[PDB]
Amino acid sequence: ESRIFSVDEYVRPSNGEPIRSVVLETNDSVVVVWHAHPGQEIASHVHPHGQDTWTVISGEAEYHQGNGIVTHLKAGDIAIAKPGQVHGAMNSGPEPFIFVSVVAPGNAGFALAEK
Template identity: 50%
Template sequence: MSITRIFNSSQFLQPADGEPIRSVITESQDAVVVAWYVKPGQEISPHLHPNGQDTWTILEGSGKYYLDKAGTMKAIAAGDVVVAPVGCVHGVFNDGDKPLVFISVVSPGDAGYQPILIETTVTLHL
């Protein structure tokens, strides 16, 4: 039995005008490998994986990466490897002028997915 072990990630990138498309490259019980193409102005909403880790390898572009429920963000760019350990909030907003392209590896494959609402403070100006 032959199992594919080498993939050309560019064949999985799917630019979209709506939300970015989660394009699965390969998956097993051990991990899910996903290619992401996030256009300028697009966002992968904040979320967490309650039972696993999500590791991103940024191939092209830049963006602002969500770090917590408070909406704290940090700049990420091509060449970065970004790790969200089990239960850590993460997501990204492409605030640049070029596509943000990265590979995500979620491990284990059944890490789960939970969307997170960012806490906002409303200040009344009288």
Template identity: 50%
Template sequence: MNNRIFTSSDFIVPSNEEPLRSVVTSSDDSTIIMWTVKPGQVIKPHIHPEGQDTWYVLAGSAEYISDDTDKRTSIQKGDFVIAYKGEIHGAVNNGDEPFTFISVVSPSNAGFQLK
């Protein structure tokens, strides 16, 4: 088994309860996560106080929450979205299909705090 090549479809797992976060791999440098967000589900606004979170949208669309005033911007398949150290971010899937994206949090010990 090669621990440097991963198939994204192996990590796409929708959940009826809340958005599902599947860790693809992790090292001290970064953690790679596959997110599956069903229509109507929300990733609550949060920050990583000690690092950056970079998203690449694979499928669907969402409203990206980018500050504490609930400012929203549409994001869709093919978009890169970056939350730099300490920046608020989250998402609402208000579409008709799953919103699927890859998140790279760096470093892995970037922390997590709801806002």
């Protein structure tokens, strides 16, 4: 029914590894809300056959691009991983790091990877 989803309703804060909170999954995209507490890492991974587009809602973090590459993200940034590109994050900031991930296509596979 609903076509609108509020991020604050969908964040799933975790003591352990951040929770992959799925808003809506379809054949065309997987839409997920991620939340990292200060000091929490979003484990690096790759979609061998899809794109992952992050839109940052709040906070500031380190974006892990693979091969030790670290770039800084803040609220209002878009971070894109094309097929095969490693992506992850470390919330090195004092506020929560919250973003929306749109993976396309909706069946893009997944592997863990190294920051």
